[PDB]
Design a protein around this ligand. Sequence first.
Ligand SMILES: [Cu+2]
Ligand SMILES: [Cu+2]
Lengths: 129, 129
Amino acid sequence: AQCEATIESNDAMQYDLKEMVVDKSCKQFTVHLKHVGKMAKSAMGHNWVLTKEADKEGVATDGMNAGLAQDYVKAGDTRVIAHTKVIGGGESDSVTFDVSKLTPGEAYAYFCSFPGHWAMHKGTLKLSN
Amino acid sequence: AQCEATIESNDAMQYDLKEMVVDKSCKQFTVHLKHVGKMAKSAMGHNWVLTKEADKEGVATDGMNAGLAQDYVKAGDTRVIAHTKVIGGGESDSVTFDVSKLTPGEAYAYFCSFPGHWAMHKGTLKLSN
Ligand SMILES: [Cu+2]
Ligand SMILES: [Cu+2]
């Protein structure tokens, strides 16, 4: 069954999916982030960033410190398995990554690194079952 | 009551009051900010900053750049009419300011300068009898 998932953000602080499962038949997985709100990214931009659960607050703060033009993700951050661009209302962005980067059975953190979003705007990703 | 107002913030990005009126008999005005949420201030802290509407973005950018130890307000910022400290869930902080810093007729901007909150977490203050 497919290896692509659409996850949505809006003008509030939550994704519509608090958890995501990457099916084990997949060699590559694409995440399609949609910002279905109406606020511009200067007020309520959102992105989607994937890391080991341990690396989350670190990535999140170096990311906030990287600025809006870097999509609030430190350029070349080794801890980021995959990330989207920061988008604003009515926009989308997608990222594809190699599923071999994930360990079967490990919970991974995904979150938004837009200033003030990482602790609320998050969820957990794992390989199926 | 007289020349005091209480305003609340929670674990989302908005105040319970979108408009605040300072009575014209007031020489001093006190704002009691309460954070009725339960999230940690490094996760979803909030403050209340009052400026002219033309200075809001300048204050919020330099506020952001000032860091949490400065309650995300640049120290000695001339455009800041008044500001609270940044509080987290289950805390409160107050600030009293001199109303002659305000001009009758003008609408003033109050907002939260915590990273990512300035353009959403906001309202208008006006002087009226
Ligand atoms: Cu976000
Ligand atoms: Cu706030």
